[PDB]
């Protein structure tokens, strides 16, 4: 008696029942459900990664990181359902706390008060401080990756693209939230740019750099920030795109007050420091929390840190999907009876 949703088997029962379609996502359908054992509502992500190495990669990383992470502002994994043998496992079901919506969905329907904008921003940075303490880069931060409640509680999700920060060493529908140096040159700075981009989107209810492709993305960023001062040029390592930037016509910086005319001055000032073109000059997570825009919520004693760094020394993109399937089977074993 496996339960069906939109002609798709969701085999989560008898524990989880009353399935309701939420949305589609990478490789899988998400549903709200009732957990009959704990008498609580949950979200359940059905994942069918096993035909694609890349999908397997994102699933393992996600499971590993979310299980290691414990924070108020980061979504957790409550339970994971899968077949009792590896040959029988064609799907993995990830059970999480049910959140009412995500920031992307909210911004379609609703304009945000500068109050809610400020508080949302604080939670993003508070979650990110923890992430960066574990020396992990999220690398995918965007509004759909930010889960929300009507009680204004925010949680960061979707760690599938996350990895340990190293200086130095695959899509992704949107380049909109990706740092300029990613197009050019990894580092904690790239998550800050993303957060800068999300803040801008809460302000105007539109993406600040909605580029249609690689170079168009650059032209968007440059249309706002203007052409780099140098010192930005010449802090660039790859010399092929430095000269590309030199070969570009001049662009004027658009002052953050002309855009976002209705925005807090303190917000715009912080926006400026997240959105700096040079990664080295870009504001760090703990400095951002300490910015006057967040003074209302800033409390470093209540802003918890990771106990140690997170460890991925394991092989990243190279592993065969059969092996990854073995690893996913092992990682999810703690949720199985007899473990």
């Amino acid at each position: 008696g496996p339960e069906m949703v939109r002609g798709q088997v969701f085999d989560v029962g008898p524990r989880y029942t009353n399935l309701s379609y939420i949305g589609e996502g990478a490789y899988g359908m998400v549903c709200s459900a009732y957990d009959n054992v704990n008498k609580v509502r949950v979200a359940i992500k059905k994942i069918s990664p096993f035909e694609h190495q890349t999908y397997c990669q994102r699933t393992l990383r996600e499971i590993k990181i979310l299980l290691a992470f414990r924070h108020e502002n980061i979504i957790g994994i409550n339970d994971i359902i899968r077949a009792p043998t590896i040959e029988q496992m064609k799907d993995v079901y990830i059970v999480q706390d049910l959140m009412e919506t995500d920031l992307y969905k909210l911004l379609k329907t609703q304009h945000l008060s500068n109050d809610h904008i400020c508080y949302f921003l604080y939670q993003i940075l508070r979650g990110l401080k923890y992430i960066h303490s574990a020396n992990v880069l999220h690398r995918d931060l965007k509004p759909s990756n930010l889960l929300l409640n009507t009680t204004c509680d925010l949680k960061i999700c979707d760690f599938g693209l996350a990895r340990v920060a190293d200086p130095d060493h695959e899509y992704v529908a949107t380049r909109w939230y990706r740092a300029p140096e990613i197009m050019l040159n990894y580092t904690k700075s790239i998550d800050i740019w993303s957060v800068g981009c999300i803040l801008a989107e809460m302000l105007s209810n539109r993406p600040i750099f909605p580029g249609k492709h690689y170079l168009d993305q650059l032209n968007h960023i440059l249309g706002i920030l203007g052409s780099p001062s140098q010192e930005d040029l010449n802090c660039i390592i790859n010399l092929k795109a430095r000269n590309y930037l030199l070969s570009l016509p001049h662009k004027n910086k658009v002052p953050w007050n002309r855009l976002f005319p209705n925005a807090d001055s303190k917000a715009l000032d912080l926006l400026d420091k997240m959105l700096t073109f040079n990664p080295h000059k870009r504001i760090e997570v703990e400095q951002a929390l300490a910015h006057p825009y967040l003074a209302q919520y800033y409390d470093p004693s209540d802003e918890p840190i990771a106990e140690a760094p997170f460890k991925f020394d394991m092989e990243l993109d190279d592993l065969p999907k059969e092996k990854l399937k073995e690893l996913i089977f092992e990682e999810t074993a703690r949720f199985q009876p007899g473990y």
Binding site: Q110, Y119, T150, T151, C152, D153, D302
Partner: peptide, 17 residues
């Protein structure tokens, strides 16, 4: 959905104190 006051959030309640 529609957003409740910020004070509905528990973390925000720890801020008001």
């Amino acid at each position: 959905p529609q957003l409740k006051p910020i004070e509905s959030s528990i973390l925000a309640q720890r801020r008001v104190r």
